[PDB]
Amino acid sequence: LHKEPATLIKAIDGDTVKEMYKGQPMTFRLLLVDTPEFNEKYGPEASAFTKKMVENAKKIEVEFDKGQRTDKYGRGLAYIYADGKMVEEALVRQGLAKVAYVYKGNNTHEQLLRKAEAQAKKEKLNIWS
Ligand SMILES: Cc1cn([C@H]2C[C@H](OP(=O)(O)O)[C@@H](COP(=O)(O)O)O2)c(=O)[nH]c1=O
Ligand SMILES: [Ca+2]
Residue 67 DSSP SS3: coil
Task: List CB contacts of 21: < 8 A, sequence separation 6 or more.
Answer: 4, 6, 28, 62, 76
Rounded to 5°, angle at Cα 58 from 10 and 16:
30
Query: Which of the listed residues 72, 106, 110 should we mutate to test ligand 1's pocket, taking the one with most ligand atoms within 8 A of CB?
Result: 72
Distance from the alpha carbon of residue 128 to the mean position of ligand 1, in angstroms: 22
Phi–psi pair at 51, nearest 5 degrees: -60, -50
Resolution, Å (one decimal): 1.9
Assess contact for 106 and 22: CB atoms under 8 A.
no
Q: Residue 98 CA: which ligand is closest?
A: 2
What is the rounded CA–CA span in Å between residue 17 and residue 61? 12
- All structural domains of the chain: 1-129 (2.40.50.90)
What is the rounded CA–CA span in Å between residue 118 and residue 95? 10
Tell me, what amino acid is at 104? K
